[PDB]
Design an enzyme around this catalytic site. Structure first.
Site, PDB file in Angstrom:
ATOM      1  N   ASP B 122      50.214  70.558  -4.149  1.00 26.87           N
ATOM      2  CA  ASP B 122      48.859  70.446  -4.058  1.00 26.87           C
ATOM      3  C   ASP B 122      48.356  69.715  -5.269  1.00 26.87           C
ATOM      4  O   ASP B 122      48.721  69.976  -6.395  1.00 26.87           O
ATOM      5  CB  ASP B 122      47.978  71.276  -3.384  1.00 26.87           C
ATOM      6  CG  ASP B 122      48.582  71.632  -1.804  1.00 26.87           C
ATOM      7  OD1 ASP B 122      49.190  70.858  -1.340  1.00 26.87           O
ATOM      8  OD2 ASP B 122      48.007  72.709  -1.400  1.00 26.87           O
ATOM      9  N   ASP B 124      45.495  70.140  -6.729  1.00 27.22           N
ATOM     10  CA  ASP B 124      44.432  71.003  -7.367  1.00 27.22           C
ATOM     11  C   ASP B 124      45.082  72.442  -7.922  1.00 27.22           C
ATOM     12  O   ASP B 124      44.324  73.154  -8.170  1.00 27.22           O
ATOM     13  CB  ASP B 124      43.527  71.309  -6.302  1.00 27.22           C
ATOM     14  CG  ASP B 124      43.669  71.961  -5.090  1.00 27.22           C
ATOM     15  OD1 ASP B 124      44.895  72.291  -5.025  1.00 27.22           O
ATOM     16  OD2 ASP B 124      42.899  71.728  -4.232  1.00 27.22           O
ATOM     17  N   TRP B 184      43.524  70.211   8.830  1.00 29.79           N
ATOM     18  CA  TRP B 184      43.846  71.617   8.003  1.00 29.79           C
ATOM     19  C   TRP B 184      44.661  72.408   8.801  1.00 29.79           C
ATOM     20  O   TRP B 184      44.009  72.895   9.828  1.00 29.79           O
ATOM     21  CB  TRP B 184      42.704  72.323   7.368  1.00 29.79           C
ATOM     22  CG  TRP B 184      42.947  73.216   6.432  1.00 29.79           C
ATOM     23  CD1 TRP B 184      43.227  73.109   5.036  1.00 29.79           C
ATOM     24  CD2 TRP B 184      43.190  74.788   6.835  1.00 29.79           C
ATOM     25  NE1 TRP B 184      43.553  74.686   4.376  1.00 29.79           N
ATOM     26  CE2 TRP B 184      43.403  75.525   5.739  1.00 29.79           C
ATOM     27  CE3 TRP B 184      43.008  75.397   7.987  1.00 29.79           C
ATOM     28  CZ2 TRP B 184      43.779  76.504   5.587  1.00 29.79           C
ATOM     29  CZ3 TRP B 184      43.359  76.726   8.076  1.00 29.79           C
ATOM     30  CH2 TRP B 184      43.676  77.393   6.680  1.00 29.79           C
ATOM     31  N   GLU B 187      50.680  73.369   9.145  1.00 27.78           N
ATOM     32  CA  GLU B 187      51.919  72.895   8.894  1.00 27.78           C
ATOM     33  C   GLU B 187      52.837  73.432   8.036  1.00 27.78           C
ATOM     34  O   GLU B 187      53.988  73.499   7.982  1.00 27.78           O
ATOM     35  CB  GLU B 187      51.723  71.316   8.358  1.00 27.78           C
ATOM     36  CG  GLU B 187      51.289  71.281   6.894  1.00 27.78           C
ATOM     37  CD  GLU B 187      50.388  71.876   6.359  1.00 27.78           C
ATOM     38  OE1 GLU B 187      50.173  72.299   5.045  1.00 27.78           O
ATOM     39  OE2 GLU B 187      49.318  72.002   6.945  1.00 27.78           O
ATOM     40  N   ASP B 188      52.251  74.431   6.994  1.00 23.21           N
ATOM     41  CA  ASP B 188      53.023  75.104   6.016  1.00 23.21           C
ATOM     42  C   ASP B 188      53.709  76.200   6.855  1.00 23.21           C
ATOM     43  O   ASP B 188      55.100  76.519   6.501  1.00 23.21           O
ATOM     44  CB  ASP B 188      52.327  75.614   5.024  1.00 23.21           C
ATOM     45  CG  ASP B 188      50.960  76.243   5.448  1.00 23.21           C
ATOM     46  OD1 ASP B 188      50.405  75.931   6.489  1.00 23.21           O
ATOM     47  OD2 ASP B 188      50.516  77.017   4.575  1.00 23.21           O
ATOM     48  N   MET B 214      43.512  77.281  -8.752  1.00 26.55           N
ATOM     49  CA  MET B 214      43.148  76.258  -7.982  1.00 26.55           C
ATOM     50  C   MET B 214      41.998  75.739  -8.440  1.00 26.55           C
ATOM     51  O   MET B 214      41.077  76.654  -8.296  1.00 26.55           O
ATOM     52  CB  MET B 214      43.040  76.658  -6.533  1.00 26.55           C
ATOM     53  CG  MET B 214      42.671  75.348  -5.608  1.00 26.55           C
ATOM     54  SD  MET B 214      42.549  75.490  -3.738  1.00 26.55           S
ATOM     55  CE  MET B 214      40.733  76.195  -3.870  1.00 26.55           C
ATOM     56  N   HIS B 217      36.732  73.796  -4.647  1.00 26.20           N
ATOM     57  CA  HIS B 217      36.454  72.709  -3.979  1.00 26.20           C
ATOM     58  C   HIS B 217      35.978  73.112  -2.481  1.00 26.20           C
ATOM     59  O   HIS B 217      36.439  74.192  -2.056  1.00 26.20           O
ATOM     60  CB  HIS B 217      37.581  71.773  -4.027  1.00 26.20           C
ATOM     61  CG  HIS B 217      38.667  72.135  -3.170  1.00 26.20           C
ATOM     62  ND1 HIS B 217      38.635  72.141  -1.838  1.00 26.20           N
ATOM     63  CD2 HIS B 217      39.941  72.436  -3.547  1.00 26.20           C
ATOM     64  CE1 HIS B 217      39.893  72.449  -1.236  1.00 26.20           C
ATOM     65  NE2 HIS B 217      40.872  72.760  -2.358  1.00 26.20           N
ATOM     66  N   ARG B 219      35.727  72.043   1.670  1.00 29.71           N
ATOM     67  CA  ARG B 219      36.712  71.396   2.538  1.00 29.71           C
ATOM     68  C   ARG B 219      36.553  69.809   2.555  1.00 29.71           C
ATOM     69  O   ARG B 219      35.179  69.283   2.603  1.00 29.71           O
ATOM     70  CB  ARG B 219      36.556  71.953   3.926  1.00 29.71           C
ATOM     71  CG  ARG B 219      37.817  71.601   4.816  1.00 29.71           C
ATOM     72  CD  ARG B 219      38.799  72.513   4.885  1.00 29.71           C
ATOM     73  NE  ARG B 219      38.468  73.916   5.312  1.00 29.71           N
ATOM     74  CZ  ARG B 219      38.971  75.003   5.686  1.00 29.71           C
ATOM     75  NH1 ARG B 219      40.010  74.913   4.981  1.00 29.71           N
ATOM     76  NH2 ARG B 219      38.394  75.964   6.170  1.00 29.71           N
TER      77      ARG B 219
END
Ligand SMILES: O=c1ccn([C@@H]2O[C@H](COP(=O)(O)OP(=O)(O)O)[C@@H](O)[C@H]2O)c(=O)[nH]1
Ligand SMILES: CC(=O)N[C@@H]1[C@@H](O)[C@@H](O)[C@@H](CO)O[C@H]1O
Ligand SMILES: OC[C@H]1O[C@@H](O)[C@H](O)[C@@H](O)[C@@H]1O
Ligand SMILES: [Ca+2]
Ligand SMILES: [Mn+2]
EC number: 2.4.1.-
Lengths: 123, 272
Positions: B122, B124, B184, B187-188, B214, B217, B219
């Protein structure tokens, strides 16, 4: 507020074993449902789910956007976005007694195995 | 030259990772003279057996990317990797699809060089210890094991999100990643299911070496939690045979080669 696994576990202790669902299973369920965030608000699309338990305004709580709701839990959905879990738990217990654990879609796929990781040893 | 050593002698261990000072990419280029056009680097010191393509799913996170490039380029050179950076930018304003963009990264990087390892990261996340090597192992590797966002602890044992690495053969084995998770979540977990079905286990560094930060942030608009994620991960065993590398379709709108990275803008449509 984003709570921890143990903070949640202690808060919902009075729900352990009800309708046959354990505290380990609930710890697992709530992490995948709301990330333990008591202010979680998620659109399901047409409906909205609230707080730690992600209780929907479709049938369970009354929201401003959907006032004609069945409001089975007899409570405003805003009462489900604070750090006082007694009323959230009372509503979750009604859903469990009426609809059952299947309301929480994360149960089957994410909480059917490896339950020991969810134990809180902090009493 | 001979093979690079097993562990790099340049490693410094723990690093202070902060995001308070503005970043100028021009300065970043200046500090990393050895990086070639397209964000490619190869040790002139020794021969590395790790030919790594680093794939970053992306849309409107330019400020994050700046910090990512600022911190990672020096780290990766220290790890003596023969690498390339790829930012896969989703065109349009439809629901964000992380996993499909990673599949695009795999196919498009293979057009440039004979890569044998793919790190999926990712935009971030920054590792806090350079001993957490950004390469592939004999089993699928989960790299961002201790995020500050989760109190430097893994949120759950089956977690494969954030930063991971799959060798080329490990990726091919699971028919790559799913193409139908929009918005969101989930998927992982599907990827984790695919690896388990193919008989693989997850390899990880310990929580001290795997410490990761991270950037804070909120969403992203258009990446709201996906309502069908739980039903989808419950059927991975059957969908992985027909949804993945073998069913991947997309359109390339642009390929950019900058000094610090390659950015590929693509139209990946919507979920079925
Ligand atoms: O609008 C978006 C949404 C997602 N992402 C990418 O998708 C990854 C997953 O991101 P997100 O940070 O929202 O979820 P988290 O890891 O924090 O649950 C991001 O880090 C980015 O690399 C992006 O670039 N733009
Ligand atoms: C929180 C974190 O560090 N990582 C992940 C991220 O990679 C992605 O899988 C996402 C769901 O779309 O959930 C989370
Ligand atoms: O944020 C941590 C993880 O939480 C899980 O509930 C989601 O299914 C994953 O997609 C996510 O990576
Ligand atoms: Ca409450
Ligand atoms: Mn993030």
């Amino acid at each position: 507020t984003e709570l921890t696994k143990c903070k949640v576990s202690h808060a919902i202790k009075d729900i352990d074993g009800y309708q046959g669902i354990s505290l380990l299973e609930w710890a697992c369920v709530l992490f995948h449902t709301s990330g333990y965030d008591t202010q979680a608000v998620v659109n399901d699309n047409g409906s909205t789910e609230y707080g730690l338990f992600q209780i929907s305004d479709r049938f369970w709580c009354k929201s401003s956007e959907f006032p004609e709701s069945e409001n089975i839990c007899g409570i405003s959905c805003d009462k489900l976005l604070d750090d006082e879990l007694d009323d959230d738990i009372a509503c979750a217990k009604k859903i469990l007694a009426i609809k059952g654990i299947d309301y929480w879609k994360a149960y089957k796929p994410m909480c059917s195995e490896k339950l020991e990781q969810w134990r809180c040893e902090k009493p | 030259l001979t093979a690079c050593p097993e562990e790099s002698p340049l490693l410094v261990g723990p690093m202070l990772i902060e995001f308070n000072i503005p970043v100028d990419l021009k300065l970043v280029e200046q500090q990393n003279p050895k990086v070639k056009l397209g964000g490619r680097y190869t040790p002139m010191d020794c021969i590395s057996p790790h030919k790594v393509a680093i794939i970053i799913p992306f849309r409107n996170r330019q400020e994050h990317l700046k910090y990512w490039l600022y911190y990672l380029h020096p780290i990766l050179q220290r790890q003596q990797l023969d690498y390339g950076i790829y930012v896969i930018n989703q065109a349009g304003e439809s629901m964000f699809n992380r996993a499909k963009l990673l599949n695009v990264g795999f196919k498009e990087a293979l057009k440039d060089y004979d890569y044998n390892c793919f790190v999926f990261s990712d935009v971030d996340l920054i590792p806090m210890n350079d001993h957490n090597t950004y390469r592939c192992f004999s089993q699928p590797r989960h790299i961002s094991v201790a995020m500050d966002k989760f109190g430097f602890s893994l949120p759950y044992v089956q977690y494969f999100g954030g930063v991971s690495a799959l060798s080329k053969q490990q990726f091919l084995s699971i028919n790559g990643f799913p193409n139908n998770y929009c918005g969101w979540g989930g998927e992982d977990d599907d990827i984790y299911n695919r690896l388990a079905f193919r008989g693989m286990s997850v390899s990880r560094p310990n929580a001290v070496i795997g410490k990761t930060r991270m950037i804070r942030h909120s969403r992203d608009k258009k990446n709201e939690p996906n309502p069908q994620r739980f039903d989808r991960i419950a059927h991975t065993k059957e969908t992985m045979l027909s949804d993945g590398l073998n069913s991947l379709t997309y359109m390339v709108l642009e390929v950019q080669r900058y000094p610090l990275y390659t950015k590929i803008t693509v139209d990946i449509g919507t979920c079925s």
